[PDB]
Amino acid sequence: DLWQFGQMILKETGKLPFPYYTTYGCYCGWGGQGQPKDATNRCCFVHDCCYGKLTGCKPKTDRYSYSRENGVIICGQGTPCEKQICECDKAAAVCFRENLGTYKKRYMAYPDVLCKKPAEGC
Numbered sequence: 001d002l003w004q005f006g007q008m009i010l011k012e013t014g015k016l017p018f019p020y021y022t023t024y025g026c027y028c029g030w031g032g033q034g035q036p037k038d039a040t041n042r043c044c045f046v047h048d049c050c051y052g053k054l055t056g057c058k059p060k061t062d063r064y065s066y067s068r069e070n071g072v073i074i075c076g077q078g079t080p081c082e083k084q085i086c087e088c089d090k091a092a093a094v095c096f097r098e099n100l101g102t103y104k105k106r107y108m109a110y111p112d113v114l115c116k117k118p119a120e121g122c
């Protein structure tokens with residue numbers, strides 16, 4: 001669920017998920033518009049697409065099992081929805097960590113007027 005995704009983000013990046021990954025670029029936030037502005041933004045875009053594939057699941061409310069061992073997130077046993085949601089969340093959290101080097105404070109609260117057409121497609 002979103003509480004768990006938030007904890008993953010904090011564990012992987014050392015940043016609180018709000019505001020650092022809720023108001024960044026064009027896609028780190030609710031949905032998005034336009035094209036991803038950098039690597040971190042593309043992680044958010046991919047995560048949105050990942051959730052999009054889970055048509056029969058409720059990714060923001062379904063709580064799943066996971067652990068984090070030798071610095072690796074391990075999605076635990078569960079329903080197919082729980083497992084797939086966990087894997088979407090893990091991938092995005094790791095993606096954020098891997099692109100912290102290019103995280104730009106400039107892109108927090110990125111003006112929605114610059115998230116211009118054409119939209120990137122999943």
Ligand SMILES: CCCCCCCCCCCCCCCCCC(=O)O
Binds near residue numbers: 002006022028029030
């Ligand atoms: C007045 C309201 C203040 C704002 C609300 C504060 C509470 C926010 C709780 C955050 C929990 C985890 C949020 C997960 C964010 C996911 C980001 C993303 O889509 O990449």
Ligand code: NA
Binds near residue numbers: 029032044045048
């Ligand atoms: Na988004």
